[PDB]
CSV table of C-alpha atoms in Angstrom, one decimal:
chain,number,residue,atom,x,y,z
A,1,UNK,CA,-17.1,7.4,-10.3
A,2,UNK,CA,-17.1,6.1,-6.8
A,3,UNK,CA,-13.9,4.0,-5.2
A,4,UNK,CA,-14.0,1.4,-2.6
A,5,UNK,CA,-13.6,3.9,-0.5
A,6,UNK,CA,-17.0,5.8,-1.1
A,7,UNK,CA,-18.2,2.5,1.0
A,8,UNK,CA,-16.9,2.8,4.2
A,9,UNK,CA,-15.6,6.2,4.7
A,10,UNK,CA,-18.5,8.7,5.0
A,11,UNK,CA,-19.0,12.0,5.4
A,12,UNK,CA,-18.9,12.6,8.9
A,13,UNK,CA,-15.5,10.7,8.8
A,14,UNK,CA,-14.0,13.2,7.4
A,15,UNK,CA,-12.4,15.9,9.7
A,16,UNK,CA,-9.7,18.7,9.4
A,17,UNK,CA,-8.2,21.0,11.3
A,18,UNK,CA,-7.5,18.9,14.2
A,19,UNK,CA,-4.6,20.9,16.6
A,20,UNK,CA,-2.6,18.6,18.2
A,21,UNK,CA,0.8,17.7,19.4
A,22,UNK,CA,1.1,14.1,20.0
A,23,UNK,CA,0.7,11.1,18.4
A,24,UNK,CA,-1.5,9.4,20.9
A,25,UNK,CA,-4.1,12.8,20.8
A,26,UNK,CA,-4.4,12.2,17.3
A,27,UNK,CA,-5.4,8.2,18.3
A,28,UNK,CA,-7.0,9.4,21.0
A,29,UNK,CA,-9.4,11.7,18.3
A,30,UNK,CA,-9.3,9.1,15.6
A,31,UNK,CA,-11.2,6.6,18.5
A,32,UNK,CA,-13.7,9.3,18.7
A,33,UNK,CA,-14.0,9.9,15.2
A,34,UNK,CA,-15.0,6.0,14.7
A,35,UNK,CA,-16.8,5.3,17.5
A,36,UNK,CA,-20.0,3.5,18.2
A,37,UNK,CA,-20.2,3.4,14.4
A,38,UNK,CA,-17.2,-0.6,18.9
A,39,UNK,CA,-15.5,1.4,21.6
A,40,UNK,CA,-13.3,4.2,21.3
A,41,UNK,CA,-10.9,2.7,23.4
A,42,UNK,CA,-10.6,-0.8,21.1
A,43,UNK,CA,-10.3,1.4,18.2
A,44,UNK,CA,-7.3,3.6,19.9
A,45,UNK,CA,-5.7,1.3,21.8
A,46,UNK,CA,-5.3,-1.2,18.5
A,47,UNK,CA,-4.5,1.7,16.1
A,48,UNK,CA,-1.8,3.0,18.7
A,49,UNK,CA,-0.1,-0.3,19.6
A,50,UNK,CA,0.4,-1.3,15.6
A,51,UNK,CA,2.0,2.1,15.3
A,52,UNK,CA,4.4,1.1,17.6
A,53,UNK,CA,5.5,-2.1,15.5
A,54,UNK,CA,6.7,0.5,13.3
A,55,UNK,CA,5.6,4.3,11.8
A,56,UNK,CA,2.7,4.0,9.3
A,57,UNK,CA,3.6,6.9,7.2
A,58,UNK,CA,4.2,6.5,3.7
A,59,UNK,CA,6.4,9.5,3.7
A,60,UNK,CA,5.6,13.5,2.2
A,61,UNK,CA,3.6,13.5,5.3
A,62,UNK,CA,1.3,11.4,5.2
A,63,UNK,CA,-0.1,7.9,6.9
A,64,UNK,CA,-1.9,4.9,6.9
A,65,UNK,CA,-2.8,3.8,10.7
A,66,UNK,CA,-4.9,0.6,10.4
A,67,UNK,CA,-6.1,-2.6,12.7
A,68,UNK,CA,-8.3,-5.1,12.9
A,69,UNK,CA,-11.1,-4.9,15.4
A,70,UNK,CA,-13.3,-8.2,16.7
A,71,UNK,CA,-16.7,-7.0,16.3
A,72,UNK,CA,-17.1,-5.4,13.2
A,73,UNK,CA,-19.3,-6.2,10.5
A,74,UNK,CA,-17.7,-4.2,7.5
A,75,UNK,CA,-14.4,-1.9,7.0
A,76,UNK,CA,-14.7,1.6,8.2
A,77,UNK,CA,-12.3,4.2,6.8
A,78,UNK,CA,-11.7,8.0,8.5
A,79,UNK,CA,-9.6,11.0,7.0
A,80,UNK,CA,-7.9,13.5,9.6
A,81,UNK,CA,-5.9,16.4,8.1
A,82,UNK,CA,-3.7,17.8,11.4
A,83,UNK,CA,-3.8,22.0,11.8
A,84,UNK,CA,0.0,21.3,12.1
A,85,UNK,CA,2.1,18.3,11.0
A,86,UNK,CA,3.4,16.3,13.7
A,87,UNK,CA,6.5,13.4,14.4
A,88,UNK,CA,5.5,10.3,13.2
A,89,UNK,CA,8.6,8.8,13.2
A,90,UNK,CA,8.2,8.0,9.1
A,91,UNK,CA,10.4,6.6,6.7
A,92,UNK,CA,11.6,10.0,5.2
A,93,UNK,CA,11.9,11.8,8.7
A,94,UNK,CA,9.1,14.4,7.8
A,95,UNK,CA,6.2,15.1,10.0
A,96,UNK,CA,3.0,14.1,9.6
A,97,UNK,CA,-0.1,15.9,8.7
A,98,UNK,CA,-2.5,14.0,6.3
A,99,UNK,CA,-3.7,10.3,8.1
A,100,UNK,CA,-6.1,7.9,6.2
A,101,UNK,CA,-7.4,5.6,9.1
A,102,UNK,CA,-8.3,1.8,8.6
A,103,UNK,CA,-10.3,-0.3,10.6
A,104,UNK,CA,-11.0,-4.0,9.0
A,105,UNK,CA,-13.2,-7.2,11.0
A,106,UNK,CA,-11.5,-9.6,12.2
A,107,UNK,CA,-12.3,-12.2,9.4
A,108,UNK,CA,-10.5,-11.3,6.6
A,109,UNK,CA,-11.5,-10.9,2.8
A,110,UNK,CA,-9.8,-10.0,-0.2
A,111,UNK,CA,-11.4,-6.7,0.0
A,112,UNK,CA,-9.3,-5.7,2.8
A,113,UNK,CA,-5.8,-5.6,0.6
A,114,UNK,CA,-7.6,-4.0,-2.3
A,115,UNK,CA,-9.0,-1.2,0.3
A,116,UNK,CA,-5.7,-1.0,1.5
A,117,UNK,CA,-4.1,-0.6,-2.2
A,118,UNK,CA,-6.5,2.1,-3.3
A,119,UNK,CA,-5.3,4.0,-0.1
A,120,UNK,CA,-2.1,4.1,-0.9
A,121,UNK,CA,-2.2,4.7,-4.7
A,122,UNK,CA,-4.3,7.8,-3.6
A,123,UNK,CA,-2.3,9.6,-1.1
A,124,UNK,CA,1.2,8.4,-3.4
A,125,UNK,CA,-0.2,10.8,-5.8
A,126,UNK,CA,1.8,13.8,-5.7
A,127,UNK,CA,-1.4,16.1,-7.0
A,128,UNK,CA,-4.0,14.4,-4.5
A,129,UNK,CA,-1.8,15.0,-2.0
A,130,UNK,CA,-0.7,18.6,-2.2
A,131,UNK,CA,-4.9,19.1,-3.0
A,132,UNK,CA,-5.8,16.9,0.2
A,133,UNK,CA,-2.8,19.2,2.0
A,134,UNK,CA,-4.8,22.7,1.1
A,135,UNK,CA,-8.6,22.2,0.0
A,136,UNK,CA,-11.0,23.5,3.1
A,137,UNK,CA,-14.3,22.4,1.9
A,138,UNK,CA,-14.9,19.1,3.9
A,139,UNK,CA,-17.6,18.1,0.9
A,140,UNK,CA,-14.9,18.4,-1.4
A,141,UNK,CA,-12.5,16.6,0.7
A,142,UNK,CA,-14.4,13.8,0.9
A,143,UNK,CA,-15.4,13.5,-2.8
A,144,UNK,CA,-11.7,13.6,-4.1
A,145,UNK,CA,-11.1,10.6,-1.1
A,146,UNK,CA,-14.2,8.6,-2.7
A,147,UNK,CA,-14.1,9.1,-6.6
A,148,UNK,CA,-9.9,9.1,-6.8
A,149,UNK,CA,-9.3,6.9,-9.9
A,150,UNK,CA,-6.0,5.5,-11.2
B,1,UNK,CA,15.2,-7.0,11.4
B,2,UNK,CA,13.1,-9.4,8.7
B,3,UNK,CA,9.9,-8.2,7.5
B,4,UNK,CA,7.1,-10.2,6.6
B,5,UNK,CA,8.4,-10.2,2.4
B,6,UNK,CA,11.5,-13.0,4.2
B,7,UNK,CA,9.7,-15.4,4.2
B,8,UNK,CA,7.9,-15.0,0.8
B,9,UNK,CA,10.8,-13.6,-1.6
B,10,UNK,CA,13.8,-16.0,-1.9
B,11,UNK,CA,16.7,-15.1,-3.7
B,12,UNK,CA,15.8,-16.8,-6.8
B,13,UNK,CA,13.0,-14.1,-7.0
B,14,UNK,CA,14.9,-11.2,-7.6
B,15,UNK,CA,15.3,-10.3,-10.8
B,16,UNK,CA,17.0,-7.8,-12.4
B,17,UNK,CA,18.6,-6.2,-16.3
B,18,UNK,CA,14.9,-7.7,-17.8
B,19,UNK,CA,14.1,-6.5,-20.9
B,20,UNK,CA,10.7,-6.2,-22.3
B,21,UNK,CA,8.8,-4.6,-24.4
B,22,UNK,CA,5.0,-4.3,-22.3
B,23,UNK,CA,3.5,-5.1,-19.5
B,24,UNK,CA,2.2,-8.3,-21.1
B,25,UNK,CA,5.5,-9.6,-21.4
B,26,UNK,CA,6.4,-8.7,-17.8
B,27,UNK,CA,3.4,-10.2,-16.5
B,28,UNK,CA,4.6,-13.5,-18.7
B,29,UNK,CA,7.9,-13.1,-16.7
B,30,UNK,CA,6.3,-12.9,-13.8
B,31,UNK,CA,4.5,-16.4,-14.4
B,32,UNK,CA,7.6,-17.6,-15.4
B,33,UNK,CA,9.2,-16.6,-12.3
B,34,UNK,CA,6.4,-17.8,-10.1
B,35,UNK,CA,6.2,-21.3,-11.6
B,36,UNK,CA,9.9,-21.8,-11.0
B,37,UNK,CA,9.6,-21.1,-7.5
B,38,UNK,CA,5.7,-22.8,-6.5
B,39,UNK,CA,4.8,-24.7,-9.5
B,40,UNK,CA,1.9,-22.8,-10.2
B,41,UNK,CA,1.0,-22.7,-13.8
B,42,UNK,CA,2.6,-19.8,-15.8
B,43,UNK,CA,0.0,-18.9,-17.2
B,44,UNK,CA,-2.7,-19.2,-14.3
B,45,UNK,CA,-0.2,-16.2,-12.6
B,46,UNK,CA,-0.3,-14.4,-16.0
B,47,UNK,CA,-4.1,-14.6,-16.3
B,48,UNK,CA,-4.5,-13.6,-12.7
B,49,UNK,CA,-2.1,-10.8,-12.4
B,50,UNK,CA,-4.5,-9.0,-15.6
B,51,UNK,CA,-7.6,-10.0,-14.5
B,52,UNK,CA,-6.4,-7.5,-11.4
B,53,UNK,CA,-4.5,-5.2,-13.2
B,54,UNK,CA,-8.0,-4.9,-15.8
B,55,UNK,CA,-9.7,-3.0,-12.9
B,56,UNK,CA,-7.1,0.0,-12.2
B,57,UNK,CA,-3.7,0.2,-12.4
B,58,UNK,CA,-1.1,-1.2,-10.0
B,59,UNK,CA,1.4,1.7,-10.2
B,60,UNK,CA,1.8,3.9,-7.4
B,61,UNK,CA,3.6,6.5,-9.0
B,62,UNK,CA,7.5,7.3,-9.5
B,63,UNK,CA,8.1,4.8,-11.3
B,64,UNK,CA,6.6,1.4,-9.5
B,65,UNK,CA,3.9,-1.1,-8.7
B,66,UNK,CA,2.9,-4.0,-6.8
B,67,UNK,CA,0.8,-5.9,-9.5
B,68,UNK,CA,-0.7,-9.0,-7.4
B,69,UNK,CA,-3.5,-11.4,-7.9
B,70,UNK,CA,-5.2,-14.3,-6.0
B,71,UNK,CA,-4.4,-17.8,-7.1
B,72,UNK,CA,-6.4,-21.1,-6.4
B,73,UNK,CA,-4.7,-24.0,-4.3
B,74,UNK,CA,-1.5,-22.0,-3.1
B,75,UNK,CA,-0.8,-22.2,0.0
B,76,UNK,CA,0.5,-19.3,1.4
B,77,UNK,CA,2.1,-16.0,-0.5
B,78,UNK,CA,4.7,-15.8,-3.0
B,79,UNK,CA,6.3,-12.1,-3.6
B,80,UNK,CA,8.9,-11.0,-6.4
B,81,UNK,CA,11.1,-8.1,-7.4
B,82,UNK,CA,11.9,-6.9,-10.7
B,83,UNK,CA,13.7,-4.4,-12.4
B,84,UNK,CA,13.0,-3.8,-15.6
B,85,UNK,CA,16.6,-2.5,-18.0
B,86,UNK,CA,13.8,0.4,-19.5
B,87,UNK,CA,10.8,1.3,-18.2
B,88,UNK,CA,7.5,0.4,-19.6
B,89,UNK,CA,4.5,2.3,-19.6
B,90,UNK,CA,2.2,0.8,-16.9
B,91,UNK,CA,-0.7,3.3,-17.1
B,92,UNK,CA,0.0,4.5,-14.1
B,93,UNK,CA,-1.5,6.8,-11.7
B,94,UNK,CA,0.6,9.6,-12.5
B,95,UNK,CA,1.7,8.6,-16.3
B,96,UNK,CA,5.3,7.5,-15.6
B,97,UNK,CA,6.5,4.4,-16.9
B,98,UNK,CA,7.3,1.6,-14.6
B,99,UNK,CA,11.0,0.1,-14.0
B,100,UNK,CA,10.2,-1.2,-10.2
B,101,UNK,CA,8.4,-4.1,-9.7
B,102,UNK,CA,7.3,-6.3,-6.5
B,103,UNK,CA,4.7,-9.0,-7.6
B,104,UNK,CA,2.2,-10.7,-4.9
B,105,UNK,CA,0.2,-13.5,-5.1
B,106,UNK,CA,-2.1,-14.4,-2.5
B,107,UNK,CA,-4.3,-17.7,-1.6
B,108,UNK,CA,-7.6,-17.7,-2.5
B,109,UNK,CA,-8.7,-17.4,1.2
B,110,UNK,CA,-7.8,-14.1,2.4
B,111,UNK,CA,-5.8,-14.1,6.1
B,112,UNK,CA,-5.1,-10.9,8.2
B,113,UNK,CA,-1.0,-11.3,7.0
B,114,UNK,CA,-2.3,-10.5,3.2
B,115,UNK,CA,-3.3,-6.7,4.1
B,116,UNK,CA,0.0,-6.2,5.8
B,117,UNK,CA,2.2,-8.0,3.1
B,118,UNK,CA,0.6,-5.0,1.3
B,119,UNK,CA,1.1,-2.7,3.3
B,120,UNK,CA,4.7,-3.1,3.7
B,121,UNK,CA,5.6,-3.2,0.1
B,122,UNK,CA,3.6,-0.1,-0.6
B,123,UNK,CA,5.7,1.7,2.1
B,124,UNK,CA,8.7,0.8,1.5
B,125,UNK,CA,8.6,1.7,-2.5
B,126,UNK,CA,7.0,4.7,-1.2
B,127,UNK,CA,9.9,6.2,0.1
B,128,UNK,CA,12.3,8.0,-2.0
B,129,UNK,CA,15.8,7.1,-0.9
B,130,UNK,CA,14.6,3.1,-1.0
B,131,UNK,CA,13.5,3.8,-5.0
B,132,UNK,CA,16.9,4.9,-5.9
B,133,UNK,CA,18.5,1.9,-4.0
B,134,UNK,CA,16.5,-0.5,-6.1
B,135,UNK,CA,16.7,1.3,-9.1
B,136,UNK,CA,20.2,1.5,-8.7
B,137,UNK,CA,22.2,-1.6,-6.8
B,138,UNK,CA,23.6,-4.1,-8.8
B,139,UNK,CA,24.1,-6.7,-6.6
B,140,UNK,CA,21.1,-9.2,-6.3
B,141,UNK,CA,22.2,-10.6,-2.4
B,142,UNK,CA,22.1,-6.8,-1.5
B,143,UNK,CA,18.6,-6.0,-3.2
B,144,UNK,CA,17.3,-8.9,-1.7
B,145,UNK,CA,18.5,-8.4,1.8
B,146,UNK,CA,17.4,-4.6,1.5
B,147,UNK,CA,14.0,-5.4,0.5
B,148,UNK,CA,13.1,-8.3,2.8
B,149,UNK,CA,15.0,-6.5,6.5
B,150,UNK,CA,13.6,-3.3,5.2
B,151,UNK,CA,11.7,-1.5,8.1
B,152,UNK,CA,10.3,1.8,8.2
């Protein structure tokens, strides 16, 4: 069955494969990813300064960049997987390759935490991860992101 | 270097060598715990924390979890760490019993702090080295002080 996540990440959010080098391209990408769904440049420039408040990776390569834009109605949720993992200055000192974004309104609920929760829980699962790591069908990507289960 | 948990777990809200049997009796603890500090109602924290935990579990694996509820007329959150002398199970995510604790409880009305109170306990029992360092130090002042100046 489906998680909170079925919601607000679609489909078309979900993207692999992306070749980069630096953090900001990967922003830079993510703004792209989410945009018009608010402006590219809201969505990057937010997401990029929180980073700088301190690394959002949970560690084993993986990350959580998140913000809050003015303007939108409902949470939106994107899943990059990076060609090559990349410095993310993260708590265990390993790059990062696998980044759940999260974009909430402004107005908070308690929705937002619980979003935020079921993120984590997924990509703390060692098996989730390594599959998230290696599947190449986007579909099935973005079924294991939206029907993970504790 | 304080993190947002400073302000929210005191001292007295460290807890460590508890013994129980099941995550009811933790979640009792936890009310117990929660009263002493706030005054809300043991059992109103008890009830809450299982009416979350009911939906999915709270573990994130290895060994912890962040169990958390909402509770009516508090005024801002209240956060606690506990390690357990055995872990229980916890149904957890990835079937390993649970020994690491850190309860939240939130107002009622959700604010834009709640989502990154979250967020920083998830990461921080997320990493590895930081799990062994709570499963390990004895000294209350020091687990408190690592968990509440922890930084990624």
């Amino acid at each position: 069955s489906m998680n909170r996540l079925a919601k607000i990440l679609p489909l078309e959010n979900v993207v692999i494969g992306l070749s980069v080098t630096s953090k900001k391209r990967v922003f830079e990408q993510a703004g792209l990813i989410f945009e018009n769904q608010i402006a590219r440049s809201t969505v990057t420039d937010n997401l990029f300064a929180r980073e700088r408040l301190g690394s959002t990776g949970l560690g084993e390569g993986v990350a959580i960049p998140h913000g809050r834009i003015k303007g939108l109605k409902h949470p939106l949720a994107a899943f990059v997987r990076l060609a090559e993992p990349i410095p993310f200055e993260a708590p265990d000192g390993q790059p990062v390759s696998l980044l759940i974004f999260l974009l909430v309104p402004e107005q908070a609920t308690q929705a937002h935490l619980e979003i935020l929760s079921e993120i984590a829980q997924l990509l703390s699962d060692r098996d989730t991860r390594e599959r998230l790591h290696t599947e190449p069908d986007r579909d099935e990507l973005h079924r294991l992101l939206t029907q993970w289960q504790p």
